[PDB]
Amino acid sequence: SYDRAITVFSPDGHLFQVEYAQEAVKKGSTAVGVRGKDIVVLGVEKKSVAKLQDERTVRKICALDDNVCMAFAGLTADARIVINRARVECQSHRLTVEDPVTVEYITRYIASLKQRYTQSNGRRPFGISALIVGFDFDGTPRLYQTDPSGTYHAWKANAIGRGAKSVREFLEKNYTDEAIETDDLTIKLVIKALLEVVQSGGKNIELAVMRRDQPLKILNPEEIEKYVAEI
Amino acid sequence: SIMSYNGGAVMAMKGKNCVAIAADRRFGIQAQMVTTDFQKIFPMGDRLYIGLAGLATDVQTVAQRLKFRLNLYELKEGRQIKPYTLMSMVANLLYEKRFGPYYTEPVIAGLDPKTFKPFICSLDLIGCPMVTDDFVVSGTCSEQMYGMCESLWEPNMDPEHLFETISQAMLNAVDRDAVSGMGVIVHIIEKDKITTRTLKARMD
Amino acid sequence: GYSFSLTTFSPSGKLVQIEYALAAVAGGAPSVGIKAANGVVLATEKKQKSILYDERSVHKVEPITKHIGLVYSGMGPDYRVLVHRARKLAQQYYLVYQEPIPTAQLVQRVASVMQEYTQSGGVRPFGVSLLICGWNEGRPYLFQSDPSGAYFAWKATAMGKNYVNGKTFLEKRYNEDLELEDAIHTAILTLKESFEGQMTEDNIEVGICNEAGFRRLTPTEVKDYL
Amino acid sequence: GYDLSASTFSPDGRVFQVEYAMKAVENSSTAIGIRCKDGVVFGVEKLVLSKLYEEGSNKRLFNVDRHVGMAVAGLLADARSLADIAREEASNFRSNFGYNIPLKHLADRVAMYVHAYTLYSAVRPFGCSFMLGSYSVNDGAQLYMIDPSGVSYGYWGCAIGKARQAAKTEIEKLQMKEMTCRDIVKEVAKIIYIVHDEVKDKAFELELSWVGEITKGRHEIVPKDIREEAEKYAKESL
Amino acid sequence: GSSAGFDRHITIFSPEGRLYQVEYAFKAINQGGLTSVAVRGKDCAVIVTQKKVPDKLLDSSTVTHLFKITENIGCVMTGMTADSRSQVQRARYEAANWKYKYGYEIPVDMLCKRIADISQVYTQNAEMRPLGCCMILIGIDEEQGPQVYKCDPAGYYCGFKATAAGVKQTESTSFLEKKVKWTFEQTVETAITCLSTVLSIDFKPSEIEVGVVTVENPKFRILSEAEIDAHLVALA
Amino acid sequence: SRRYDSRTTIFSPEGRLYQVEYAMEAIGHAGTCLGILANDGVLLAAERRNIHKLLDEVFFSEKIYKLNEDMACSVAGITSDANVLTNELRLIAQRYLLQYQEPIPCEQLVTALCDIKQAYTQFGGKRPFGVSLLYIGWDKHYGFQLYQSDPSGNYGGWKATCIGNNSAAAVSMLKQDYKEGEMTLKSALALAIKVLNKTMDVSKLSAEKVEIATLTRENGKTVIRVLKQKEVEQLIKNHEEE
Amino acid sequence: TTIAGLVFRDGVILGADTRATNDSVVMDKNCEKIHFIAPKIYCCGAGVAADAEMTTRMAASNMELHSLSTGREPRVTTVTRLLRQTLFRYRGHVGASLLVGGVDFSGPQLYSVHPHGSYSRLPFTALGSGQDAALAVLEDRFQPNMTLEAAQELLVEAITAGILGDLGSGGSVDACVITGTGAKLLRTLSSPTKPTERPSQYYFAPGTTAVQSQTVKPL
Amino acid sequence: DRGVNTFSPEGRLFQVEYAIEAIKLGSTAIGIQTSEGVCLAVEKRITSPLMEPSSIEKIVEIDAHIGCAMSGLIADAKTLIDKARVETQNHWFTYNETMTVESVTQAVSNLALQFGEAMSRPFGVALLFGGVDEKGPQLFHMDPSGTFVQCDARAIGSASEGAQSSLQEVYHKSMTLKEAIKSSLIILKQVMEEKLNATNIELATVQPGQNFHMFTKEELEEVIK
Amino acid sequence: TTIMAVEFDGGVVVGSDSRVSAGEAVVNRAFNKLSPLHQHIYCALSGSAADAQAMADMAAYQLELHGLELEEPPLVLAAANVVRNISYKYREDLSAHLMIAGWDRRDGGQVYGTMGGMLTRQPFAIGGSGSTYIYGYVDAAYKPGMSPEECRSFTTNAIALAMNRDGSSGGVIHLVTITAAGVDYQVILGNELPKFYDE
Numbered sequence A: 001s002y003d004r005a006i007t008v009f010s011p012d013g014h015l016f017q018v019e020y021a022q023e024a025v026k027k028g029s030t031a032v033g034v035r036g037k038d039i040v041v042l043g044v045e046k047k048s049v050a051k052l053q054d055e056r057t058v059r060k061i062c063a064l065d066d067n068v069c070m071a072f073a074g075l076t077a078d079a080r081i082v083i084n085r086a087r088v089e090c091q092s093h094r095l096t097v098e099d100p101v102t103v104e105y106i107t108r109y110i111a112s113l114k115q116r117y118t119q120s121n122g123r124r125p126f127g128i129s130a131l132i133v134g135f136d137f138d139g140t141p142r143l144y145q146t147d148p149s150g151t152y153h154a155w156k157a158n159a160i161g162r163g164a165k166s167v168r169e170f171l172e173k174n175y176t177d178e179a180i181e182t183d184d185l186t187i188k189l190v191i192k193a194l195l196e197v198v199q200s201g202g203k204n205i206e207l208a209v210m211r212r213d214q215p216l217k218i219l220n221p222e223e224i225e226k227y228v229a230e231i
Numbered sequence B: 001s002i003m004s005y006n007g008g009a010v011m012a013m014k015g016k017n018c019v020a021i022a023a024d025r026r027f028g029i030q031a032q033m034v035t036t037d038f039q040k041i042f043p044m045g046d047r048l049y050i051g052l053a054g055l056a057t058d059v060q061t062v063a064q065r066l067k068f069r070l071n072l073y074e075l076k077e078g079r080q081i082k083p084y085t086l087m088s089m090v091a092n093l094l095y096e097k098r099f100g101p102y103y104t105e106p107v108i109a110g111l112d113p114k115t116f117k118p119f120i121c122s123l124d125l126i127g128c129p130m131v132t133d134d135f136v137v138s139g140t141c142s143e144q145m146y147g148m149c150e151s152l153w154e155p156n157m158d159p160e161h162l163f164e165t166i167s168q169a170m171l172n173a174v175d176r177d178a179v180s181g182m183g184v185i186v187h188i189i190e191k192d193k194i195t196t197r198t199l200k201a202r203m204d
Numbered sequence C: 001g002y003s004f005s006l007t008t009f010s011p012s013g014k015l016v017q018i019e020y021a022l023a024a025v026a027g028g029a030p031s032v033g034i035k036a037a038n039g040v041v042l043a044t045e046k047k048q049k050s051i052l053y054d055e056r057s058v059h060k061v062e063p064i065t066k067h068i069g070l071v072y073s074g075m076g077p078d079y080r081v082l083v084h085r086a087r088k089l090a091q092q093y094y095l096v097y098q099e100p101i102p103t104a105q106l107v108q109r110v111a112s113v114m115q116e117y118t119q120s121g122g123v124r125p126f127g128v129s130l131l132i133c134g135w136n137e138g139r140p141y142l143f144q145s146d147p148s149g150a151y152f153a154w155k156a157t158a159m160g161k162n163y164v165n166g167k168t169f170l171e172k173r174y175n176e177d178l179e180l181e182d183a184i185h186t187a188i189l190t191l192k193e194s195f196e197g198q199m200t201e202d203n204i205e206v207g208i209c210n211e212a213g214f215r216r217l218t219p220t221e222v223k224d225y226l
Numbered sequence D: 001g002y003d004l005s006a007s008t009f010s011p012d013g014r015v016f017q018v019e020y021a022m023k024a025v026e027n028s029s030t031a032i033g034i035r036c037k038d039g040v041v042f043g044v045e046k047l048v049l050s051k052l053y054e055e056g057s058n059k060r061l062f063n064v065d066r067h068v069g070m071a072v073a074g075l076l077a078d079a080r081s082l083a084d085i086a087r088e089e090a091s092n093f094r095s096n097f098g099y100n101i102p103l104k105h106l107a108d109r110v111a112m113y114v115h116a117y118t119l120y121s122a123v124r125p126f127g128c129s130f131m132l133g134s135y136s137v138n139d140g141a142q143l144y145m146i147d148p149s150g151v152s153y154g155y156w157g158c159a160i161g162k163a164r165q166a167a168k169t170e171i172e173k174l175q176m177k178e179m180t181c182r183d184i185v186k187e188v189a190k191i192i193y194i195v196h197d198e199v200k201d202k203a204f205e206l207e208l209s210w211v212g213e214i215t216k217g218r219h220e221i222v223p224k225d226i227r228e229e230a231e232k233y234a235k236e237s238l
Numbered sequence E: 001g002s003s004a005g006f007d008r009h010i011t012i013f014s015p016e017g018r019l020y021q022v023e024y025a026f027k028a029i030n031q032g033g034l035t036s037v038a039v040r041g042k043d044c045a046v047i048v049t050q051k052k053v054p055d056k057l058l059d060s061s062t063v064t065h066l067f068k069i070t071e072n073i074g075c076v077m078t079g080m081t082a083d084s085r086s087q088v089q090r091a092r093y094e095a096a097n098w099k100y101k102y103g104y105e106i107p108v109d110m111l112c113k114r115i116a117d118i119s120q121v122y123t124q125n126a127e128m129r130p131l132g133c134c135m136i137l138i139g140i141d142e143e144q145g146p147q148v149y150k151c152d153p154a155g156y157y158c159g160f161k162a163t164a165a166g167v168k169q170t171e172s173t174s175f176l177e178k179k180v181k182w183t184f185e186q187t188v189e190t191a192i193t194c195l196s197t198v199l200s201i202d203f204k205p206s207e208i209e210v211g212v213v214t215v216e217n218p219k220f221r222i223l224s225e226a227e228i229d230a231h232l233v234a235l236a
Numbered sequence F: 001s002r003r004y005d006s007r008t009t010i011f012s013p014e015g016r017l018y019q020v021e022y023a024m025e026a027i028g029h030a031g032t033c034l035g036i037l038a039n040d041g042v043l044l045a046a047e048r049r050n051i052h053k054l055l056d057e058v059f060f061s062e063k064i065y066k067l068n069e070d071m072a073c074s075v076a077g078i079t080s081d082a083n084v085l086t087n088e089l090r091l092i093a094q095r096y097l098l099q100y101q102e103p104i105p106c107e108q109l110v111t112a113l114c115d116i117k118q119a120y121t122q123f124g125g126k127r128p129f130g131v132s133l134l135y136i137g138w139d140k141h142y143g144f145q146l147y148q149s150d151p152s153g154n155y156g157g158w159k160a161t162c163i164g165n166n167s168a169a170a171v172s173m174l175k176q177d178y179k180e181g182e183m184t185l186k187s188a189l190a191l192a193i194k195v196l197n198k199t200m201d202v203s204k205l206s207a208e209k210v211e212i213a214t215l216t217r218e219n220g221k222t223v224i225r226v227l228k229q230k231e232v233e234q235l236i237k238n239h240e241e242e
Numbered sequence G: 001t002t003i004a005g006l007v008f009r010d011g012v013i014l015g016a017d018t019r020a021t022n023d024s025v026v027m028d029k030n031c032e033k034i035h036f037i038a039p040k041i042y043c044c045g046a047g048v049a050a051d052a053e054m055t056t057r058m059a060a061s062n063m064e065l066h067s068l069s070t071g072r073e074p075r076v077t078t079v080t081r082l083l084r085q086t087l088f089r090y091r092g093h094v095g096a097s098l099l100v101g102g103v104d105f106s107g108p109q110l111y112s113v114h115p116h117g118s119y120s121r122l123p124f125t126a127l128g129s130g131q132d133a134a135l136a137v138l139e140d141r142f143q144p145n146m147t148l149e150a151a152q153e154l155l156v157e158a159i160t161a162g163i164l165g166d167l168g169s170g171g172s173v174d175a176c177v178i179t180g181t182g183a184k185l186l187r188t189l190s191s192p193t194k195p196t197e198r199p200s201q202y203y204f205a206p207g208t209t210a211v212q213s214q215t216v217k218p219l
Numbered sequence H: 001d002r003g004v005n006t007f008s009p010e011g012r013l014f015q016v017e018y019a020i021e022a023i024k025l026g027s028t029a030i031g032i033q034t035s036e037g038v039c040l041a042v043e044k045r046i047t048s049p050l051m052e053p054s055s056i057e058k059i060v061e062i063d064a065h066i067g068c069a070m071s072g073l074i075a076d077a078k079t080l081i082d083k084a085r086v087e088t089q090n091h092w093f094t095y096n097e098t099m100t101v102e103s104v105t106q107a108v109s110n111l112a113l114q115f116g117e118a119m120s121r122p123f124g125v126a127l128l129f130g131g132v133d134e135k136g137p138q139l140f141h142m143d144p145s146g147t148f149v150q151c152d153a154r155a156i157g158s159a160s161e162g163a164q165s166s167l168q169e170v171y172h173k174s175m176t177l178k179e180a181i182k183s184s185l186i187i188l189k190q191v192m193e194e195k196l197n198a199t200n201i202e203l204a205t206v207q208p209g210q211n212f213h214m215f216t217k218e219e220l221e222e223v224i225k
Numbered sequence I: 001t002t003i004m005a006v007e008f009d010g011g012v013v014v015g016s017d018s019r020v021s022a023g024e025a026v027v028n029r030a031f032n033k034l035s036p037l038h039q040h041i042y043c044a045l046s047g048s049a050a051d052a053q054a055m056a057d058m059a060a061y062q063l064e065l066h067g068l069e070l071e072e073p074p075l076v077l078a079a080a081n082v083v084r085n086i087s088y089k090y091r092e093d094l095s096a097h098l099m100i101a102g103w104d105r106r107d108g109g110q111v112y113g114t115m116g117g118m119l120t121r122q123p124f125a126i127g128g129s130g131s132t133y134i135y136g137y138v139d140a141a142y143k144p145g146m147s148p149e150e151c152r153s154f155t156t157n158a159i160a161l162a163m164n165r166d167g168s169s170g171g172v173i174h175l176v177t178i179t180a181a182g183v184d185y186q187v188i189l190g191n192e193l194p195k196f197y198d199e
């Protein structure tokens, strides 16, 4: 059994492997989340828009349960592993607590798993960052963000992946209450933010909105085109 | 006994360049009949069938695990299994559970994939083979089946005569058995075709 | 033991340890395999360092079963490991299916073991290439299994010292209608092209595979062919 | 670097790690063993590195069994571990076969245990050398020495430590074969006083132990009064 | 002579396809400075080895390179002493086990093969080095007669008519090469002569060790100082 | 121990996995593998590397392996590594059938194998498998499908794709010749030949240098067959006239 | 089951009946009970039929490996040691009662091996439910160093006694003659019993059997 | 390259020394223990304006009578925090009583050096344990080396050197909780890069008779004036 | 089964019956219950045939290895200890009493009873089902200072008396005399056994 310590402290007090995992997240596709009144907006750069590709097979936005969705950035293979670990956690929680998990509860589990891979022998840290959204049992909107180190925070609006800083810098000046007033207004803030880094913004951007007691309702090419048209 | 909990009877007969396999269709728990179309004979190749009698749960489990093993074998070897090789495969599977056995006595019937020579055999619950030249029986009414087969079976029977023989053997044998019956299914395996017939039987 | 791999991928996409294992095979004693119409012949050069060695104490051509024979080129002690493992694999197969393992099935299992040593922790790959022959369902087989775990079916082939010339010689001499006796003659001739000085019946080993089974040719028999 | 691991042979066929462990033994103080007609006598020049230490501290003479004594040189912690291994081996033999383990067999077992730490990178070679002395009516007097590589031999006289060469010359002058334990004790004391350095390693304590006909086959520390005569005699000699 | 990475430190293949660590193990056999010679007769096998004991305080009887594996199998070790002892201990165990599970005494060639197979594992696994020794085995086989086998650090083993190991191995091989191309007294004399000629030394009874096995007396036997002297006087 | 550890599963300074990238380099030089999806089936066309005259033919194929009753795959990269993964795929499919008594859906099989590949790149200290695969299959949920997965553990569905030698050039040709939803097996076979002719550098395409397998539905059952020399030879003839 | 063996002047003769029964009903009228272990070593099995079959197959396999490595002919003593060490391990649960016979370098050897792992080397033995009857024939007429034909007749009479006296035995007598030169497996050496000729008979015509459904599938 | 349990020439474990370096990059946390109780104040150090301040938890409850402030790698602290919570509840179950501050700190400290090649490295965090038991208000401090000690006043984190100086110049044995709460906030504001409001800091107290109490926004504003 | 061993000045005499039984049937009427563990060390078997055979083989193996390691002939006490160890460790599973007798250069002729894991050295020992009927006989007939011939005669008589009375004993009498000179085997057939009151 491979028991070599992979993640260790560096002279300046940094965890080299964790910083290298963060570098991998930077090369990942841009993802943007924005909190709304009674719906959460998630925008991911589709990038790979080949004409010989079966689009449905490579979705970045996924469902963790019936009430929680999530987007990721970085190593896509690492992401698929974490998503499936969380799915099992949600099932376990419904069979021992007789109630669906809250947004923070699944974020905590995911963040805790990421932290465990930075202090375990024989393994490298996960090379991804995630944006978790949804609504709690009552009906309040949430937006969390976990990173490779295992730390997570709640946000009003956030971006991850390539050129995350640029989308984050632009998000401060464009996030307000009027902007997230109506459901169709929550889709406007996201797209603009994505447009600051996404090449040929239009058919290179995937979309998804999580409403109240409503399933993963992915938007469609023409649906998104409407907003793009007006803009 | 555990072998009479669900009932059932299976028999295989050798003919001239052909084989026949038959079984009852009753699925019941003790005295109560549940269904009258329970499957006991499973295909294990183009001209190779296996009949399982005994505990219903083990009948399904053995058939499924055997299918799992045979499928992997066919992919790896790139060929159809020989009747005799399947018998060994089944014996190995049953012997693994020497102390905590599957309660089923399988009956194999088929023609070799290259020479089309008829083959029949019967194994016990532990996995001991009994390759014969005439017939093999298994189930709650084995004594009745032996009687019918011993006096009716003839060498070198053609497909039509073989069908009549195995049909009469099973019908009269299951009629003297309380937990076996509710219909009889018969498979006549020839080199060029497989014929499946359901017989008109008593439903009491 | 070490739990990490010793064979890894280099920048250009190669696995140098496997390539180095192939260099050990290439510097080994020459081995030839020829598939005839009714049998297979395995011939190898077995030149001892001196006359002090007892020729009939160790063999290079080994039976795996009654219908399967083996020969190698490369590291002798590594070859012993595989021979023992091949015999074990053949017996396991026989215990389950009650029939002699088909040559192709045995080669696949032996190649799988060799593949394991190119990825498993703390070990180097085997430094040997194998030539496997057999007779299944009224038909002869000839396979080659190398250090990486890859295996090929051949009509005729050569390994070890000067194998490239041996293969070219075989291409201009081998025909599909060849018979075992004729195959044995051209097999010895192939070894003669790369041989040093004086091929006797004590410095070469020959194995044959037909319907009767696989057997190592006796020195008396080899003398007659020479 | 060909000398970083015990599982690495150097180009000229040497295991440098095992040789580095032997250097540690050569830095230690001298211990000698003499086999006579009646038994075996052990003598150690135990250096007193501080006045704060009690007399008898850090002893280098052990009892590994009722009839077996052990004299060590080198890393004391490594040596103590080896003494425990030997004790367990003797006890195990008594349980399995019902009688006192023969010295030669005990020396073989311990040596192979020592040899096991010279083949891998996972462990390092022991940094000590030791002698095994014993006496029984059946076997007579026996004296074996095992070094860090695991090689063990029987001796008539042996010395280990820094002044092993100078001590050996002194031991060769004696005719121990026809001598008895009583007269050999004084000689052992004498040799240790001769090989002891004064300029360096000032202040030492003499440790003596023996096993033979005089102790009825029981290995024990030489009686104080008998050690007094030896110490007296050795002081006058040099 | 090309090298790459850690090929001179662990048992991994070098660019040429060589195992440097195994080659270094062969050089470790010569570190002891001794030479051994084994000769097979018509109905006997003889092993002779150099016996150097210049320490003087050493108990001569405990200094030996001849070992009894079983009642009918003897052997001579050459190379690192501690490595040799463990190999001898392993061989004794292998023989005892074979007898226990198969009901008969292990054939000399089977024992040599078993030891060679254990040695092979060290050349393929990186965590442990090969033993720096060489083992020569002798014994009488019911049908084949007298056997002489030898296995080395590489895991290679073979049967011989006559063989040698150690410092003067090459010259012993040459000397015996001509002779081979014999009664008990002739086989013994041949072995002693080879050793004496390649070492340029007029041997004395306590300077050599002799082990034998014959068809008449299969039990492995060590000659005494008086028995060796008789042969030494007949050679002179 | 630490001195010899090659550290195969660690991040490099720029967040890259060297072993995975080096394994991708090996796959790029291997034989060309192309997959095309049509309306009435799927096909696999792979260039053969074993072309020596003294080689014998006695297997189903060389690079095309049947996985179960409704699925086949093609490999590119280390041959012996592919044998390990192909055997694992067969077991995964049989285990699913034992549990649900139904054939495993195509995408589920690919995902299970990708999980094993991902695991090698994260822990264990072993070198990754140097294989890239193309899957063709039919299931009751999505009908005819085509998938491609690589050493990193990533996979994707495609209408037409290519892996191995000159796959980048093969993909370019496919983009300008593949008609979404207007392709047929006969029309897909011609495109395969066309693409294969360009990527390969040996003038005469040759029937002996390639292997083609098709997957179709016949009378409620999946049929997978490797085209024979005659059929392949005829296809090459068509291209000449084309 | 009646199995028996004797050592004669030049070798070993093994014998068995051919009846296999399920409780009190005859399942197989021609079960082969003498099994090949090696070219010059055979085994007769009594007791639990699946245990005998598996045990002898495992032994033959291990003995073949052994002979491939050593390059020599297997000894009868090795077969007895492998078998008895396996049976003792299972503490009698593997119900294999065997008669092991063979010829090796040391001459002909006969052993009986029992389910718990005990064994005995003897010049004649019998096992199975008909063992007392066969043993009575041997005790009454065995002599040492018999000729091949006298030993064949004696073993046949011993198996025949079990066939006629024990309800668990029947069918034919099979024999295995092993010598230094050859092995003669005489499956069906004697056929002392046979079904009666049968006076009348029964006949079923064309559509005597009423059929409900029918599917034909062509191959 | 060395192993994780390698000693340096000056007698120190490299990894433990590097873990202490990580504590210096963390937010400043202040602990003050007086006769009326213990107060814990930690700088939230919010990186961006879009980040929710409430999601940042540097001060947590271990049990009703024990509070805990963390500094350094926050993700590593969670493992220790949960361990501490489990320890006290296990203690309650077994002995039907509350665990003392010292005992809890001792139990958490015993997990610091448990790493090798199971943790593969030491924790990169420093902890401040404040609570009340039979000995009254108690403040303990634990670092990555597994060393824990009782303290009257202690600062950990990025500006711990500056905070300590102020602390030792303004701390006395008679000072009440109100003074401690005010004093600790005064020092926090002085070493904080950003402006000290009621949303960018965390404060909690534990007094005899009262449970662990995290000050609310309103309560901070009142005290902040 | 009836086994007996007697110590004499310079060696031991060990003997037994030859009957193997399965209920009322005699499965082997000429079985050899005297088994050599080493050149001068023997053991008599009683109880379960499988257990005794397995134990004897395990011990012979352990003693053989031990002898080659120590470079000398094993002591009789060592052989008894090895047998005692195995017998005590597996007392719950084994049903066999392995009586040990032999000669060594240190203690001469020694007889050890090791039934159930308990080791006891005696001048003479008797075991097996048939030994119960000869207790009175051996207690009244045994005399110290008996010669090997007398010991052989004493052993033959006792075994013969037990064979006549005990249903589980019978057949022939196996006899072995062990000394420094070696092992001497002897078989007293049915028609040559001592005769006593029979009708």
Ligand SMILES: *[B]([O])([O])[C]([C][C]([C])[C])[N]C(=O)C1=[C]N([C]2[C][C][C][C][C]2)N=N1
Pocket: G114, G118, I001, I002, I019, I020, I021, I022, I027, I031, I033, I045, I046, I047, I048, I049, I050, I052, I128, I129, I168
């Ligand atoms: B004696 O009666 O104690 C005798 C001594 C043995 C040979 C060491 N034992 C037996 O008679 C005896 C018989 N059996 C088995 C009975 C069932 C068939 C196999 C033999 N076990 N011990």
